Design a protein around this nucleic acid. Structure first.
Ligand code: MET
Ligand SMILES: [Mg+2]
Ligand SMILES: [Mg+2]
Ligand SMILES: [Mg+2]
Ligand SMILES: [Mg+2]
Lengths: 137, 124, 92
RNA sequence: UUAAUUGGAUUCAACGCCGGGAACCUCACCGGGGGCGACGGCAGGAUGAAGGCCAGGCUGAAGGUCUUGCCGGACGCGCCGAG
RNA sequence: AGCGGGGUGGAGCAGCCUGGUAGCUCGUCGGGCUCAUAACCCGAAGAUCGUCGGUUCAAAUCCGGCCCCCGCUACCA
């Protein structure tokens, strides 16, 4: 279980307020659409640009560990810049490993629920662009 | 806007001796008719006349590609061998004086592909 | 023309590694370091980007395999028209 | 490319070369239709083997085969070897 | 977010400032040389200049509005 990475899809607020720092690090609020956010997980767009790795997450001044469904949290990420790299109101996807997807669909099929399966399915549909493996899911 | 062949309607062509008709055709047809018809053409012509009379309610199939179209053959449909199968030909008035084989192509049209290895000097 | 029978499956050659070793991408989304039997090695020339039949080794059947047959242009065209295999597997 | 576009020859020492100027034949290729087994033996066979035909269908056209019954007298691929 | 810089064949650069032919090297296709390949020689294709407008006898060159790319700084949930 510790080896695989949970799927996750989020969308940036179209609100200017949530942006608290632009670069080094990029600090911006987020609401979770599906899946679970964890520290040290790479995020990619539809075209797959490496926006970096989530450096830290905080719902308040306190330090957090993870965020579940229906929770808002400010992410401080590295390698992402508003504008050229990321735009407000744009939807972000968690990069997935095909071995991890196979493990989730076959080995760890007991610990999978509605939001997780929806997120993983739509992530596979989105990633079905280059490798036919995601096309066949 | 009727049909005429040398100033004659179709019916005037119908009531003509084979010799009188031969004076209207081009030289190749005239020489072919003057030298007589081959036995195979005789059998085909017999079948055609039978079909016109009201008998022989069967399709006409023939290997004779060198038969000349004649006015009394107008209106019938003939199946001419092209090498591997018989194709239907519907005889129209403006076909008088042509060989049957002209209406049954023996080669397929060519659609080229990509040149293969050895098509140019550099590919060898 | 012959089809895989058993654990065999198709594959696309990706890169030759030398000394009769190829790197074949199979239909199950795996990359395998495949070994060419010498019987057909001497008479059949294989080049990157071909449809072939690969049987995985009995032990560690995830990264090793043997190539048994090569599909010519007419055979792969017939397979594509029939629909047993798609175009994106061949094109990648 | 095609039903087939028959094959050989690839530096000098293959490419108006195979005496290769192919309408048929040539011809080896493609579509279709017919014919053929010395010599041994098995079935069978003068109570007639094998073989041939006026007419008419089938057919591109054909006693090739079928329909319709006439002609001929001693060998026999329906079976096995062999040629 | 503010400031500064730049968009030209498939690729990387001239041609500005001084308006009036769109060049340079590599790359692709074809023919040469060699028993054959690479190297070398010849010929040809390929951008009408990031878009839109203004100016001018005439604009890739001067000017302005947009689209994209790059750099610097402010920016602590
Ligand atoms: C931090 O200032 C915080 N209020 C930003 C949004 S948390 C989802
Ligand atoms: Mg030839
Ligand atoms: Mg000639
Ligand atoms: Mg001939
Ligand atoms: Mg060379």
């Amino acid at each position: 279980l510790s080896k695989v990475t949970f799927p996750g899809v989020i969308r940036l607020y179209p609100d200017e307020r949530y942006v608290f720092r632009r670069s080094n690090p990029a600090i911006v609020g987020i609401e979770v659409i599906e899946g679970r956010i964890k520290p040290g997980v790479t995020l990619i767009k539809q075209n797959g640009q490496k926006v970096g790795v989530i450096r830290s997450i905080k719902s308040r001044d306190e330090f957090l560990q993870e965020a579940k469904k229906g929770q808002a949290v400010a992410i401080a990420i590295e390698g992402a810049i508003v504008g050229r790299h990321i735009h407000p109101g744009e939807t972000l996807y968690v990069d997935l490993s095909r071995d991890d997807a196979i493990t989730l669909l076959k080995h760890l099929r007991d610990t999978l629920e509605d939001t997780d399966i929806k997120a993983l399915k739509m992530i596979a549909k989105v990633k079905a662009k280059e490798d036919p493996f995601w096309r066949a899911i | 806007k009727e049909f005429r062949y040398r100033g004659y309607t179709l019916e005037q062509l119908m009531n003509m001796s084979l010799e009188e008709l031969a004076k209207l055709l081009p030289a190749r047809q005239r020489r072919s008719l003057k030298r007589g018809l081959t036995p195979e053409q005789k059998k085909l012509l017999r079948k055609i006349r039978l079909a016109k009379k009201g008998k022989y309610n069967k399709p006409i199939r023939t290997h004779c590609r060198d038969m000349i179209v004649l006015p009394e053959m107008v209106g019938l449909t003939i199946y001419v061998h092209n090498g591997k199968e018989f194709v239907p030909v519907e005889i129209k008035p403006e076909m008088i004086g042509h060989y049957l084989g002209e209406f049954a192509p023996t080669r397929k049209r060519v659609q080229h592909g990509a040149p293969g290895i050895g098509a140019t000097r550099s590919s060898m | 023309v012959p089809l895989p029978e058993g654990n065999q499956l198709f594959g696309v050659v990706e890169q030759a590694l030398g000394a009769g070793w190829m790197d074949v991408r199979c239909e199950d989304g795996k990359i395998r370091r495949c070994r060419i039997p010498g019987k057909l090695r001497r008479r059949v020339w294989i080049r990157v980007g071909d449809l072939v039949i690969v049987q995985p080794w009995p032990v560690q059947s995830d990264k090793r395999g043997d190539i048994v047959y090569r599909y010519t242009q007419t055979q792969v065209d017939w397979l594509l028209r029939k629909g047993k295999i798609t175009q994106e597997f061949l094109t990648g």
